[model samples]
Target: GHMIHAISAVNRHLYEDVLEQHFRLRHDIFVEERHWETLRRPDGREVDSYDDEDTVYLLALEGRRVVGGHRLYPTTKPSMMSEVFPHLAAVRGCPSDPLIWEWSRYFVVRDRRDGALNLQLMAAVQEFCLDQGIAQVSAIMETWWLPRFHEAGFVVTPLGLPALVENAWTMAATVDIRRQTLDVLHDRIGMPSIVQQDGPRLDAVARANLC
Candidate 1:
């Protein structure tokens, strides 16, 4: 079994050690592997200004190790989508809405990619949104993800045309989060639910049976 925790400003103190590992894992994937020159650090930990306390972290743990994780930033404030990659959304413009958030740093460990962790992480994202009343999540992803999002049953809308960035065709888009998204994820993952609920809402609505 796996446990997914939504760590936010409320419960961040409880995950200090795990948070450190989360950063290191990001370094392993993003810096060491992906060769993001700007993100390389002497300490071997990947971190950026967007990692403030206000950002919520969705982490899947096998026992004590963080096997998968991602971060959600409030769109009301400055986010990577609005600041770093603003040019990615030329047509629709960078979103600034209370009901929307920005998603980033989504990844699973190298050895655990083929398992159910990917679906669990996806389910947790939709579940977390449904719990917090978040209606959508915007992201800057490679164009290849557009099809995957559609296959995963996410209602996606591209904010702007795709452009080459760091040698990859990238575009900014939004994912509409709803109960239907959770249903598709559950059926795909063959699980009823994935979120363990430790953030703003404990008795979250996503836990209720869709049937």
Candidate 2:
């Protein structure tokens, strides 16, 4: 089973720390190897205004260290959807429910590639969505990960050609959450009980340098 925690603006520090770790990992994997351009902040932390918005971040911790994380941005606020990737706007039959959320920047910590972690993180997310009465989750497809999202109970909605971002083409898809899927996810990956505070805004560290 996995643990779930709903992060809010009041206690956003926990989310920021985890996000910093995620950015560090991304820098090591994407920037160091030249896979992507060097991050603006040489410190290797990823931060954006989106983090401060109506977003829910799911953190999977093993003992004291974070193993995996992903952000759930509610459509109730403006999001990268129809902006960074306008191609995704073409999705048809996709539920436009205000309660729906867009999932993004999903990353697993380096060296923790066990399948159960991702499954657990997703289960936690499903539990959160169910609790919030959310109806759908959308995400930009990276590579052939569509099947993986499908296995997690998302209805795959193709958004035509891939959107170019920093020379990489990203596919887009959405998932419709049915009661049965939520039940399965919960049963497979249990939710977290306690959520601790992380403290302070690290945007200053992130914005010190902008590439």
Candidate 3:
């Protein structure tokens, strides 16, 4: 019964309250729990330079509560992969293609960390990519997540080899986006639709930001 909403600068004003709560939630999850100390803030909001207006946020909400979410940043600009961790990808380097977006900050609430919810979010991600004409989405995550991406119907291409970061094995990779991937995720999760119909369309705004 949960829905994933794509929130962007276009409709952010309408969800200001929950948007702030979402930041607080990120603070709790990444900064407090994961020991991402650089993200700590006096306001207790886990926001960084990549959270600019052009970023698209896919938030999973149950009623008014923000339970889980992921952030998508246009690879036309600098991303965490390109800016912060370029060393992770020594071979292909970081991508700056318009057809490729960078994904980060995926988190679910502590109590609701279940496979079903994560699959739903992953499905929503594919749906968003299909709708937006995104060819691929790059990510920097633990190498262990590689198989999960494969299981979710993604044709993942590793940009570089895995290296230890913060004592965890991490790698940079990109996943092809297609209608078939969306179909497979839906069939695997048994969810007909995970993305909401009224989500923001960032095509124009995202283009303009390139200037």
Candidate 4:
């Protein structure tokens, strides 16, 4: 059971509104629920200074509501790695590309248990990356959700044996974009159907669906 959804890159103004909601959601799920140990905040806004610059956000929308989302930052930019997680610098083989994208701050509302929706969201991201010729995606892996990434055909690269943050150890994983991975994503998510059936119609649909 897969459903076709839309994914798009947000502009500055729209980015702000979506980002606020994104932070609010993160606060609700991670901080309030105590699911994530380090991200505790009293105000319930999970935002950082890095959000403002050099970031491309991919949003998954069903009609007018955002169901899932992820933020991508170029590795060339001065990100948490250059400042906070310098210890990973010693990792033997980082991607050689100057334009590596770090995917982070991902979320899906708890109620949307549609397997199709998750697959569609990821397919949208892969579509964007393929169009832009992006070669790699990186993320801080959640311990419980690690299997899902593997199921999606991502090659996981463990970083530094999982350092503790907020009383949990999260590893780092990177996925290299290849034809096999794209094919699996397309089949799992119905992306090929969406593009073929709704590509031309989605422009206005995307505009209307904006937050």
Could you tell me the TM-score of candidate 3? 0.93
Top lDDT model: 3
Clashing residue pairs found in predicted model 3:
none
Least accurate stretch of 10 residues (summed lDDT) in model 3? 197-206
Per-residue C-alpha lDDT of model 1 across residues 28-83, encoded as one tens digit per residue: 99998888779998999899988885678899988779999998877777778888
Highest TM-score, which number? 3
TM-score, candidate 2, is 0.73
Estimate the overall C-alpha local distance difference test score of candidate 4: 0.59
Clashing pairs in 4: 37-166, 38-166
RMSD (Cα, Å) of candidate 3?
A: 1.8
Residue 52: error of model 3 in Å? 0.8
Shift in Å, residue 147, candidate 1: 2.0
> Tens digits of per-residue lDDT for model 3 on 90-196?
89889888888899999999877965788898899899888878888999999889788877878898899899988889999988988988998899778888887
Each candidate: what lDDT? 0.83, 0.60, 0.86, 0.59
Q: 50 in model 1: Cα distance from truth in Å? A: 0.5
| Reference-based lDDT, residue 138, model 2 | 75
* Candidate 4 deviant stretches above 4 angstroms: 1-10, 14-16, 34-43, 93-97, 193-211
| TM-score, prediction 1 | 0.92
Q: Which regions of candidate 1 deviate over 4 angstroms?
A: 199-211
Q: Model 2, range 1-211, lDDT digits (tens) per residue?
A: 3344456554565456655665576566546654655444555665555666455677666643566777776554556765666565564533234656778766676666777677766666566666556666877756567668777876566755666666766776676666677677656755342233245432311221221
